[PDB]
């Protein structure tokens, strides 16, 4: 039963792990460049907020509060870039494992799905980096500019920044996963509406997983998911 599949899975999981390790080495060789890319929007926000602050009066900068914070951030950023660099190998190995299983009817809707899903994920990250972050970061820092001093630490920033970038990519993949399921025909407008009663519970179940144990973080994450489900209604309604 599982004897031939586990032998095949082992030799494909080995290649994927190797790809991450090689991607990690390449990412760590250029960790200054990747950190500069990640850290650049924050420097723009702090400098831009500083000019507003130094105008009402007429400082803040990026810090690290752990001894190993700089090294760990470089590893964490390199690890994340390594997984992203290994995604073509990981997905190619994933496809080769399930390619014989899929029938020839639905085998030609997987490559466009992977290409379409990946290209939409890239747009989500670029949109979050170049359109959302420059205005979002400036607004957030300005909120506590007249009250507190923004001594932003890199350890908590990288996690905050990577979640925004990763989250927006998936936030763009939800309106295309539903669209892909719509043209072929598997769910209609009614199906995505009469299953909302459960779907709200799963959304709050998903919100709890991806947030600290605070309720506010749950609601602050359940609200975007509700709208993504809402946009999914019109996408199926239009098709």
């Amino acid at each position: 039963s599982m004897k031939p599949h586990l032998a095949e899975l082992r030799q494909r999981l080995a290649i994927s792990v190797l790809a991450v390790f090689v991607g990690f080495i390449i990412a760590f060789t250029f960790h200054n460049a990747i950190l500069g890319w990640i850290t650049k929007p924050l420097n723009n926000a702090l400098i831009q907020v500083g000019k507003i602050v130094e105008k009402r009066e007429m400082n803040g900068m990026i810090t690290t509060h752990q001894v190993g914070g700089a090294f760990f951030v470089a590893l964490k950023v390199s690890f994340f870039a390594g997984i992203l660099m290994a995604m073509p190998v990981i997905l190619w190995q994933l496809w080769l494992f399930i390619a014989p299983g899929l029938y020839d009817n639905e085998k030609k809707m997987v490559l466009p799905f992977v290409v379409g899903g990946s290209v939409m994920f890239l747009i989500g990250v670029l949109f979050a980096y170049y359109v959302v972050t420059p205005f979002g970061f400036q607004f957030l820092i300005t909120f506590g500019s007249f009250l507190y001093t923004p001594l932003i630490n890199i350890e908590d920033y990288v996690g905050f920044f990577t979640k925004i970038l990763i989250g927006f990519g998936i936030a763009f993949e939800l309106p295309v996963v539903a669209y892909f399921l719509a043209l072929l025909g598997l769910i209609t407008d009614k199906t995505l509406k009469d299953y909302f009663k459960y779907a709200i519970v799963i959304i709050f179940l998903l919100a709890a997983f991806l947030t600290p144990p605070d309720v506010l973080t749950q609601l602050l994450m359940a609200a975007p998911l509700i709208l993504l489900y809402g946009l999914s209604i019109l996408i199926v309604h239009y098709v």
Binding site: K197, Y198, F204, A208, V215
Partner: protein, 42 residues
Amino acid sequence: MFGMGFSEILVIALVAILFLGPDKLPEAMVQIAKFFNSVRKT
């Protein structure tokens, strides 16, 4: 447990009562138990 607190549990149940409502909550309750029983005997 996996990132979910206790007060986290109550909100999810709070959505469960509000949206599933008087009906359709027992239907889900007996479906979850059946699903829970399904994996037990397999």
